[model samples]
Structures are given as structure tokens and as C-alpha cells.
Target chain A: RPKVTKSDIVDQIALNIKNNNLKLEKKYIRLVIDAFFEELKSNLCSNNVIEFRSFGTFEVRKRKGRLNARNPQTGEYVKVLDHHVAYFRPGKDLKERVWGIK
Target chain B: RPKVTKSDIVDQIALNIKNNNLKLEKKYIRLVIDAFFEELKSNLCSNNVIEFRSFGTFEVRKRKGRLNARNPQTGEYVKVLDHHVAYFRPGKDLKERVWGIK
Candidate 1:
């Protein structure tokens, strides 16, 4: 019943760094992780595919427009235009790790 | 037409570290990144929810089973049991960044 947060990930990596006698501090580890995801968002926003090899791939996809969309407050029928969305494809290694796992 | 790969992410982060006068080499940077995602896979396989603040959340969900599943190659009836699957929720900032974007 242990918990892992974003901070915890940094802590574990920091521990690994210490074990390997690396010079990475937790401060910069946090920064790198922050920058990593922000870069993911930026690339996805630009419609670029981000492949993390065995980890996964992040890509932006287009969502079809809906002509039957309705307004929530006004209850008005609205036509929606096509828009872009972000999605991820889980990589082979990770998927195989979780397959049939409960 | 600029392109980005997983190495590019590390390269940019290494550049940032250089800008900050940090002592992180691409060697340990690569190790940290690899360990980072493997930890995610481990936690998710354990049914833990991984969140990155404003970035996104990765979670494992139970996929419902079907009693009348058909065999793909053998053309036979089969019953499938409920299994766990991983999914992600795009964060508010990332989602908004991509909203209405073509």
C-alpha cells in the first residue's frame, strides 16, 4: 500500500543518481521532468509525433465536428467544427507488461 | 519542417542543464529518462495512478468482458474475463493548448 507521486519519482531517480555517483540534484531532476512534459505538450500542440521508443508515443489527432451538438445553458443546437486533440499510443513493452494483469 | 525524437527531448534538456551550469551529462540524463518511464509502467501495472500535476494522469482501468467473444482465427465462441488496461487523461493546460487547433 505504498504511494508514488511526481515528487516520489524524482526522489527515486535521485536515489538512483546517488547510487551511481551522479551529480544530478533533486532540484534539477524536478526541472527536467517538468520540462519533459511541457515539451510533450508543445510538440503535441504542434501536431508532431513524440515517440519514446519502448515507452510510448504521443500524438495529436483530429476530432470530427458534430452538427448535433447542443448548448448546455441555452439548450440550443450548435454545429461544431473539426478540432485537434491529443492522444497516446502505449508502447509494446509497457502494453505487454500490463496485459492480462489485474 | 523541424522534427523531434526522444533523443531530441534529452538533447533539449541537456541544453537547459548546460544553460543552468549543471553537471548532468547526457549519459545520466538518458538513464534518468529510462528509469522514469519504467517506474511509471511498474506503478501502473500495480494499479497506481500516475499524475504529473498540470500535465496529465495515467491510470489503469478495468475493461469489461464479453461473454460472446468470437475467436479471430479459429471461428469459435469464447468468453473473455475482465482485464486491466491503461489509459490517460489529457491535462487542462495541454487540452486547452490543443483546443480548436488545427
Candidate 2:
């Protein structure tokens, strides 16, 4: 693929708001974008799970160190560093949307 | 603990947007909220993974039939139906944000 694009998603959201009479503006779309990352970032930082009513939850995972070897640009073997990782877990409401449970 | 409030988050985001000259308005915040759920819903429905740079990815999980579910109110036993679920996995950039890495 030529890499996923945002236009499709934007149009989808615009259409949803329009059809639903959400009284939303382009600015509201922008805010949603900002908040998506903003809220997730804050919650994950504190190891807090962000629950959006029927949406889903955002959480962070502490990745334990692991040993792995890799070839360097110079053809030298190097040990990879280990660190924590972040993870997101969606809720039932979201799953229903995907499965067309309605 | 007291229920999580948005004031602190609003303050943080407002400060960040201001310092960065993001030209963001309150309307933008609302949009961000709407889009947050919009994108995930679309991706999960299509069985496509939603990925945001430096943020995270969203996907769906097919939940097989399970047994045993409880009533939210008036404690009672209920058969838990099988269904799909949603999940999120944060990226390295997000991990750093939480870890306070500079």
C-alpha cells in the first residue's frame, strides 16, 4: 500500500457528524485529533487507563529487558537494549461497532 | 480517589497548545474527542489496524463464546455471550512520553 492516509478517515467522520446532526465544525474535528493523542499520552504516562464511556481503554505496559542480538551497519554484532512498551485495550462497545453488532 | 477530572488535562493541553502556537481552539478539542472514537470504529469495523505515528494502533479481537457473566445490578448469574473485542497498543514515542524520556 502507499501508506494509510487520513483523508478517508476525515471524510468518514465529517459524514458521520453531518448525518448525525452533531453540530460539529472542522475545528471540532481538529480538537478530537489533538485530544486523541493528548489524553492517551497523559493517561499512559501515569500508567492510568483512559476509559471513554463506551469507547475503550488506554494503558501502558512496562516492557521487561530482553536479550537480542543484531548486526550493526559496520557488520558488528550488538546487543539490543530492552525497555518498557505501551499498549491499548479496546472495550466491548468498540468491538460491537466493528462486528456490526447493531 | 476522587474521580479523574478534565480540568487538569485541559490546563495541560491548553498550555501545550499555547506554547506551541498550535492555533487550536476549544472547538478543536471537541473534534479531537469525536475523531478519537471515529477512527478506531472505522478501522476495527474493516478489520484494519489503525496506527497513529508516535501514538498507537487499534485493532479488534474476535471473542469466542465464554461462560459466566454477572448482572451489573441485583447480583445475578447470566450467560456471557460470545463476541469480538477491541484493543490498543501504544508505540515507542508514547512510551517515552509516559516515561518522561527527553
Candidate 3:
């Protein structure tokens, strides 16, 4: 199955804006959508938490630095450094919607 | 530290548009932001995957139904039904940015 693309959301929002009588040009709507995603990326890169009501929360989880690993190619030992991981926790509303139950 | 809110993103996008000399009203920016999020929620609700280039993919996973559980209050047995789960897989760009490594 074909997956939904970010462009799909952008188009959907533009249509919604038009239907709602919101005065926004299509190009402007695209810019806003792209900017929003870009901002989200930057915030996550900075290890910030983004909370969307009734949707979910996006946060960065830190992984311990300096882990030992074996190189699959040559069986050589390698050290892995610390890093951050991104995670999302669905809100109660979304959970229920997914489960289709209260 | 204070968590970033959706309003924060909305304001950031509006500011970005103004700086770019985009011809869009602030009110329209707000509407577009709200509509974009709403569309995302609806798409996820339908168990569709949202793919953003160089960002990540948002998809729904189905959890097995009929799991055993217990009620803490009454110590009674309970059954958990099947449900859908939402997950995000960071793209290569995002992973490298988070880890600060290539």
C-alpha cells in the first residue's frame, strides 16, 4: 500500500483552510506546513519535548555513551558513543481512538 | 525546563513567514497549523502511515488482543482486547543529528 506523504498533509490543510474561509494562499500554506515540520525537527534536535494536546508527546531520550560492540565485518571490538533517541507517547484520546474503546 | 507547546510552533511559523516576506495573515497561519495537526490525527486514526522525507514515518501497529490482566482495586481478572499502536521511526538524518555522528 502507498504510504501517506507529508505533501498529503499539506494539501489536506490547504483544503481545510479554504473550506474554513481562512485567507491563506496555497503557496503560503505549503510554506507554513514545511516550516512547522522544520521547527519540529530543530526542537527535537535540541532535545526538547513537544506536547500536543489529545495527540501525543514527543521527547528525546538519552542513550548511555560508550558501549562496546563487535564489528560484523571483521570481528573487531568497537566502542559506541552516547546519543539521543526520540520517542512518542500517545495521549489517552489517541489510545482510545486506536483501540476503539473507552 | 518548560515543554514546547503547539502554540509555540504556531508562533514560530508565523514569525518565520513574516521574516520571509510571505503574504499570509497571522490568523491564517494559526488555522493552517491547527488544521495540519488535525489532519495528522485523522490519518493516524485510520491506521495510515505518514512519511516525511528526512524526518520520520508515523505508523500504526496492531497489538494482539485478548491479553490477561488484573484489576488492582478488586484483584479481579480482566481481558485486554486488540488495539492499535502509533510509532515513529526516525530517518537517517534525524538519527545522525540526535547522535551527533555520521
The DockQ score of candidate 3 comes to 0.59
Weakest 10 consecutive residues of candidate 3 chain A by summed lDDT:
A93-102
Error of 2 at B69 (Å): 14
Q: Every model's DockQ, to 2 decimals?
A: 0.53, 0.25, 0.59
Q: What stretches of model 1 exceed 4 Å from their correct place?
A: A1-3, A18-23, A67-80, B1-3, B18-23, B67-81
Q: Would you estimate the TM-scores of all the predictions?
A: 0.80, 0.61, 0.80
Q: What digit string (tens of lDDT, one per residue) describes model 3 on residues B1-102?
A: 349998898887778777877666667777887887778877888778889888888888778765468888997888887777777888877777777622
What's candidate 2's i-RMS value?
4.3
Residue range A22-70, candidate 3, lDDT tens digits:
5566677788887887788788877788998888888888787654688
lDDT, model 3, position B7:
85
Q: Model 1, B6-91: lDDT tens per residue?
A: 79988877876677776677876777787688678888888788887777888877788987899999979899878766777788
Q: Using alpha carbons, what is the TM-score of model 2? A: 0.61
Better of 1 and 3 by DockQ: 3
What TM-score, to 2 decimals, does candidate 1 have? 0.80
Of 1 and 2, the candidate ahead on TM-score is 1
Q: Candidate 2's C-alpha lDDT?
A: 0.58
